[PDB]
Design an enzyme around this catalytic site. Sequence first.
Site, PDB file in Angstrom:
ATOM      1  CE  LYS A  20       2.307   0.450  10.729  1.00 45.29           C
ATOM      2  NZ  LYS A  20       1.237   1.192  10.008  1.00 45.29           N
ATOM      3  CD  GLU A  53      -0.157   4.083   9.859  1.00 47.80           C
ATOM      4  OE1 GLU A  53      -0.023   3.282  10.799  1.00 47.80           O
ATOM      5  OE2 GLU A  53       0.419   3.942   8.753  1.00 47.80           O
ATOM      6  CB  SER A  66      -1.020  -0.004   1.113  1.00 46.38           C
ATOM      7  OG  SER A  66      -0.388  -0.266   2.347  1.00 46.38           O
ATOM      8  CE  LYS A 101       5.016   2.725   6.003  1.00 53.69           C
ATOM      9  NZ  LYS A 101       3.736   2.986   5.295  1.00 53.69           N
ATOM     10  CG  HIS A 105       6.467  -3.373   9.540  1.00 56.36           C
ATOM     11  ND1 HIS A 105       5.918  -4.639   9.686  1.00 56.36           N
ATOM     12  CD2 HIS A 105       5.446  -2.498   9.706  1.00 56.36           C
ATOM     13  CE1 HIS A 105       4.620  -4.534   9.916  1.00 56.36           C
ATOM     14  NE2 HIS A 105       4.313  -3.203   9.983  1.00 56.36           N
TER      15      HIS A 105
HETATM   16  O1  LIG Z   1       0.768   0.969   5.399  1.00 52.84           O
HETATM   17  C1  LIG Z   1       1.679   0.777   6.241  1.00 52.84           C
HETATM   18  O2  LIG Z   1       1.742   1.491   7.262  1.00 52.84           O
HETATM   19  C2  LIG Z   1       2.737  -0.307   5.931  1.00 52.84           C
HETATM   20  C3  LIG Z   1       3.269  -1.160   7.080  1.00 52.84           C
HETATM   21  O3  LIG Z   1       2.288  -1.797   7.949  1.00 52.84           O
HETATM   22  O4  LIG Z   1       2.264  -1.152   4.893  1.00 52.84           O
HETATM   23  P1  LIG Z   1       2.885  -1.086   3.406  1.00 52.84           P
HETATM   24  O5  LIG Z   1       4.344  -1.405   3.704  1.00 52.84           O
HETATM   25  O6  LIG Z   1       2.165  -2.190   2.647  1.00 52.84           O
HETATM   26  O7  LIG Z   1       2.740   0.385   3.059  1.00 52.84           O
HETATM   27 MG   LIG Z   2       0.898   1.347   3.141  1.00 54.60          MG
HETATM   28 MG   LIG Z   3       0.114   2.823   6.864  1.00 51.43          MG
END
Ligand SMILES: O=C(O)[C@@H](CO)OP(=O)(O)O
Ligand SMILES: [Mg+2]
Ligand SMILES: [Mg+2]
Lengths: 424, 426, 424, 425
Positions: free
Chosen positions: C385, C282, C41, C334, C362
């Site tokens: 998280k 979130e 996502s 991230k 993560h």
């Molecule tokens: O959306 C999020 O916050 C992340 C991690 O849980 O998911 P993705 O890495 O699929 O963006």
């Molecule tokens: Mg995401």
């Molecule tokens: Mg997210």
Amino acid sequence: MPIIEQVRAREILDSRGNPTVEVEVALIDGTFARAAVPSGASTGEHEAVELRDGGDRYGGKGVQKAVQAVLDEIGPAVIGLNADDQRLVDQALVDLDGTPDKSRLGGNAILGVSLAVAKAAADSAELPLFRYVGGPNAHILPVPMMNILNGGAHADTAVDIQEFMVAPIGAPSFVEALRWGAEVYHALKSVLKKEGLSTGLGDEGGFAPDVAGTTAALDLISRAIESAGLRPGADVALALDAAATEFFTDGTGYVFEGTTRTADQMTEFYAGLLGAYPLVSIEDPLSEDDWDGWAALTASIGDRVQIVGDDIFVTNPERLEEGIERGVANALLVKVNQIGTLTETLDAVTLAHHGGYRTMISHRSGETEDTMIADLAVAIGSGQIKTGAPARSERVAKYNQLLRIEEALGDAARYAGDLAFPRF
Amino acid sequence: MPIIEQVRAREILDSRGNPTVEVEVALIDGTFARAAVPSGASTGEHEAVELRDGGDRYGGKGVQKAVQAVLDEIGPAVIGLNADDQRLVDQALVDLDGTPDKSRLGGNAILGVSLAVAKAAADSAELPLFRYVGGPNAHILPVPMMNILNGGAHADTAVDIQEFMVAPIGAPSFVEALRWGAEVYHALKSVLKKEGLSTGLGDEGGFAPDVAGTTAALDLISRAIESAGLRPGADVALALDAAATEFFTDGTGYVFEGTTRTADQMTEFYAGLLGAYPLVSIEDPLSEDDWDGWAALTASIGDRVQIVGDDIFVTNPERLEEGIERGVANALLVKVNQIGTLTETLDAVTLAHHGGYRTMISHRSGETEDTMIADLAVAIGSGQIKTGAPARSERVAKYNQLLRIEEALGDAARYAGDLAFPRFAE
Amino acid sequence: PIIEQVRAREILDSRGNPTVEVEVALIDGTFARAAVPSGASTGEHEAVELRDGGDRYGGKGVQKAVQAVLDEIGPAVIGLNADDQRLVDQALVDLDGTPDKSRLGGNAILGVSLAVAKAAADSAELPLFRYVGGPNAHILPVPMMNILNGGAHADTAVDIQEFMVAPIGAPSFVEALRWGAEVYHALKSVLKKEGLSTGLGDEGGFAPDVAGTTAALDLISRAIESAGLRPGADVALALDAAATEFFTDGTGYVFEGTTRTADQMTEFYAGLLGAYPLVSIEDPLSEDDWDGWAALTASIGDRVQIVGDDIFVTNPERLEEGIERGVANALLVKVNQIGTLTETLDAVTLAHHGGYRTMISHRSGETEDTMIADLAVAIGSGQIKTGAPARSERVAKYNQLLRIEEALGDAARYAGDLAFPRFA
Amino acid sequence: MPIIEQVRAREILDSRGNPTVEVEVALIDGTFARAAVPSGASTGEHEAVELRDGGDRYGGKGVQKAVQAVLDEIGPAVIGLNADDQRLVDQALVDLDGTPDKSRLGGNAILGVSLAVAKAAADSAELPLFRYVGGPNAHILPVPMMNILNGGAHADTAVDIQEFMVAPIGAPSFVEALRWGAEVYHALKSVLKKEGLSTGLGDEGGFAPDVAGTTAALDLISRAIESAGLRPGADVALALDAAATEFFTDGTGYVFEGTTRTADQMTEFYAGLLGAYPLVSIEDPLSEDDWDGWAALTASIGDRVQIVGDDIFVTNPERLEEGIERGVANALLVKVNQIGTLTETLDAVTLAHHGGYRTMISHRSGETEDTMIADLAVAIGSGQIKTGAPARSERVAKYNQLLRIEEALGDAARYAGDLAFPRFA
Ligand SMILES: O=C(O)[C@@H](CO)OP(=O)(O)O
Ligand SMILES: [Mg+2]
Ligand SMILES: [Mg+2]
Ligand SMILES: O=C(O)[C@@H](CO)OP(=O)(O)O
Ligand SMILES: O=C(O)[C@@H](CO)OP(=O)(O)O
Ligand SMILES: O=C(O)[C@@H](CO)OP(=O)(O)O
Ligand SMILES: [Cl-]
Ligand SMILES: [Mg+2]
Ligand SMILES: [Mg+2]
Ligand SMILES: [Mg+2]
Ligand SMILES: [Mg+2]
Ligand SMILES: [Mg+2]
Ligand SMILES: [Mg+2]
């Protein structure tokens, strides 16, 4: 940092006073190792080629050209490689030579480099060579198979069998086994003196008397075992190396003990010996290429005695593979210089082990003060080594090095003993 | 001076979120190594005992007692030994415990120290673990036997077969094999969506759909193979782990796919599969003590397919030797934590190899971030490894390590490929 | 600590898709390794993740990213001092020369960036948390555990992406961990009782196809109580709606069977606030719905933490805009959304100095890399998280926090309920 | 510094398969060195005492007691000392034992520690042993005196003389001298096969045929030299070791080739050989204690040929100091294990070397893979070594080690060749 920095060779002399190659390998970390290359007398037609100088020096047996191949071509091919990458290094040497029998640079020039790389790698790791090569599981001390009465190619007599060996399978430890072998060998010297017989040594340290044949030799050795206070069979058993390729003529047959005989006829001779003597092992009972002979002999006596292939296999994976397929022999004699690299040697050991065959690490009749085969026997866990009478230090140095390995292993040491010979 | 100076242990979590042992060993030369212990779900009766705490913490699954065994007893027993002397250390641990099944200290406390000692020795010697353990001749990258559809004890479905595996035998190298397996795995996910079946993962990272039986599962995986552009058999072949102990009841027999069957009926089922699918290997087709059944099944199909002893052998030389003597199985699954020391594990390996049996290094269903088994597979030249679907990093970290080993080995790397499976011929 | 060598390779992530791993070696012999995560996502505005396309790996190869490291990135950084993170990150950003790292790839750049950081720490003989965060680094974060997974991270129709438990009442990280594991295993047994699926989604959380948000939360509350813990006081709840994934521009939020305005979603969330012990929500709204976030934040942001993820993409520029407009009260962090460690630290600083909380995260595609565990402690977030306590790409991060907690000894503090001042 | 930190010993086997002592010394700086002890068959009455176990193991020839003595007594008496102070170490060894012939702890136990400490010191200084003992001026490669036809105590034949040796004095280097000796050795084998004589080896790798006389043996060797394309005397000379003690009976005399003979009849014999053969050296031509025979034989023929004392001097400063005073022999055979320390060996050499006498470093008939005598020959500049036929590696390893020393010396190496035997011409 175990990167190969220098490679140098010299001509030294083997235990017969003939030239051979010795190689030293230096690493960038300061590690320095030395390995020497043995030389056979009863060499099979299919052995890796040994490069000799010809000409007048040393009766044509110089190895200056082998030494020059190390300095001019081999050194430069391997300098900069990681000594730990044994397979890489061995592949590079095989490719550089570019012939299947190592005839261009010589198995003798190649093997010295191959073994000195393994030794330097081990020293740089600060591991004993048995442990560097066999990993932490290495621990089994081999039964020493001691050639104490030497015939055929190894002395100047008319006894047909090349090697008459004692095997102290009944001993509790290698240190004790070594003692039993020495005491039998000393008892034999005394039995020979008391008969009229010569106690001059042959090439491998065993006595070279001129007795009527196989059974006369075996009765003399049985007497020596009892003289030493030990029991034939339970304490010290017997083994042979016939090196039958040496008394085979193509088109004629086996020219043996008075008679020209066939494979099946040689088979019945050995079979007779098994009923009358505590024999654990018979090596090269038939000639190097008598495949049908070996297949018939193996089916006939293979369940009752170890049958060791030497000249039939030449430590060569292709040959050993055919042997395993055709049901030929149940053991491989392991001679690093019959194939020419450590890697190919270990490939042969693996192929044998996985095929249910046993291995016996072997010297050559021309040996040096090098003790590497003692460490190899322990590393591959063969449980069997053949490296001479307990006399002449090119043989004894290997026994002394097995004492040192056994002592370093302390309580984890195990002696192969009876378990090396399940058919007995 | 790779002399052991300190031995520390702690409780970490495994890949199911349950407690397990991690051990750190330090040598006087400053070397420090860490190893973690895996945990099974479908555990044979005869495995070395895994010491758990009981009580309330973590549902009874704590390993504080195993951790305390390492600090009070194992540590003091081994400090001052040379890390290089693996057999001497392992004998000392066995003796200290004093019981045949490692029930006093725990096979989990014992193995952590055994494995950490081996890692410390290798780091001190400055050799990679595959090379320390296997010596300089180690070079063979194993076929990754990937469990891409999980059943039995590893999920909550009615699928009785534990593990449905793909085996990329036709690949030219390990790096390419890993790609083929991942590609089939992703194709399978796609086939499962199309069929409206669950893509939720089981314990070992494979999909856990609740499919009707063995043949439905095998058929979905053959479709995945073809959809990934690969040839079933010649490129990607199949394997099973039935874990048949888990559906066997004593005297009653095998409760399998809705009926009760004898060992012979189970054998005819497997033979029926071999005729219909490109199977290279079947593991635990029968139960851990069904020695009569296993001897008959081995004589019946053992020439046509590899037959792997797991719960029957429990990586135990005493049990493997019986198998070899009774004509039971033609391969050994190798799980260090079934027996509890590296030494005994390598003793079971040598005995299999010398006995004409093949070996396959195995994860447990409760794995960790530890990658030791990747190096071990290369060290023993098994040519076969079983360490998960290519999903969940406690599985993928092993595959990643095998990529690193294959790279380290350069031109000397060899991938076992279809030579690992001589009985098979697409 | 001079950089001497930079290598990259293609490895697989936790879903079996390729990703980048880099190694950095320094003159002093130090060698460190870092891997790059990958989201499913992914916000529109994240740094570019460079993929190969073509057939291999369904188009998801990263050989081009690996080639970018060996061809261009390594040469540009070799010879710089690994300690100078800010100079190395500037060099990386300048070498690419595009705002969103589309030329070399954010995956090629981040891997070198993190690996430089690990190497400098190893070189100084310092755990990563201490290297980056200095002597005052000491706070163990509340593990926010996604124990029931929907939206993008499984194949069910549950619209909310993550259902998290937050063990705020635990006295320590080590106890927080056990609490979250105990609730996780209690959830599994609740699901089996209800006949609901226990198969795992991408982040290790169960992926049952439940009727909707309150059904999920009721099952998690049951699990908390089944484990002997109090919802709220012991273990609270959090959400990541990933609402960008159910918003279509011009239509609205397509959510649990109706179509809703930002305002109606706000009402839904406020309803959840009243009925359940929620500490954090979130991405309640879509990535560019700035007006909606503003009104929601003014409406419920005093009662619960509101975390920007896809709206801020770890990007100083986007966060500075959110701060000015009253958008959210926390930042999800991230590293791979922005592409360097330096720019990540700058987002944190901008948040921190602006009274916004941070939660290190993560991606749904993780590796055995554990850097984010050290990073959370280094920056003092008090919140991380990194998954359900199952699947080792998640669990290796928790194990690494145990080790950090241990090494800090008496200086360790667990953030517990002080991370969530708006709760109770 | 190079301070001694551990001393271990073990029982190994010698070249005849009898036990002997091996010792390892470890210094605090990491150095580990190893030395082994040889053992003779034709041992002189006055040699330092060789401690044997007796009993049943190994026909009485075990050295477990000597090994135990190293662990119990010598080990702790030398740990803490500086391995560089050879003299202080050898004094501590001699005083610990406390007996003049090393009979309490054993010459075999003592020598092993003495030599392992020297090897350790050398390794710690990162120097080859020849250079460590001999200092920067050590450079002379010795003539190899090669026993290629073995008799007396070293085989089971009726040959009276113990050793028939070739000496490649004409070679330009050690490396060439080695090849000359190997080529003669191999040519002798083929000669013996022609004559249907035994090519079975004796203790020292020489052939042990049962030939008729001393002259029959020299004629066969002489043919060998010529058959090897070399010139007797000018290229390759001849030496003898008669080991006369092994056929002397106190009272009745010299029992030799089927005749009792006086000291002066044997001299008459030796001087006949001198005229008919290219001889450079005769060793122990008379018995260990026949002091007057030696004085007379040495007056009679010592101007014309090297006369080597072995059993008469037993590498012992006292016995030699005597031989010099009484005009006995003109060379000393040097066996470290006849006296039992390296320091006392170097002392006996110094006594000889200052006093006109030449020295020849010697093996024992029971040798090991130890090569220390090769380096000791070069260290002391002897110009002569006696270490076997070029066959059996307990011999050949010494020769190989001389190859490496020659290499390492480079342009500094000198082969002693002709200059070792000035009386020959
Ligand atoms: O959306 C999020 O916050 C992340 C991690 O849980 O998911 P993705 O890495 O699929 O963006
Ligand atoms: Mg995401
Ligand atoms: Mg997210
Ligand atoms: O035949 C053999 O096995 C060997 C060793 O005894 O002899 P050679 O090296 O002469 O072949
Ligand atoms: O049965 C097996 O072989 C293993 C590995 O897949 O599963 P478990 O660890 O649960 O025994
Ligand atoms: O007499 C000697 O000189 C030596 C050496 O040849 O023999 P032994 O060691 O038997 O005394
Ligand atoms: Cl469901
Ligand atoms: Mg032969
Ligand atoms: Mg042979
Ligand atoms: Mg199982
Ligand atoms: Mg199984
Ligand atoms: Mg003598
Ligand atoms: Mg003498």
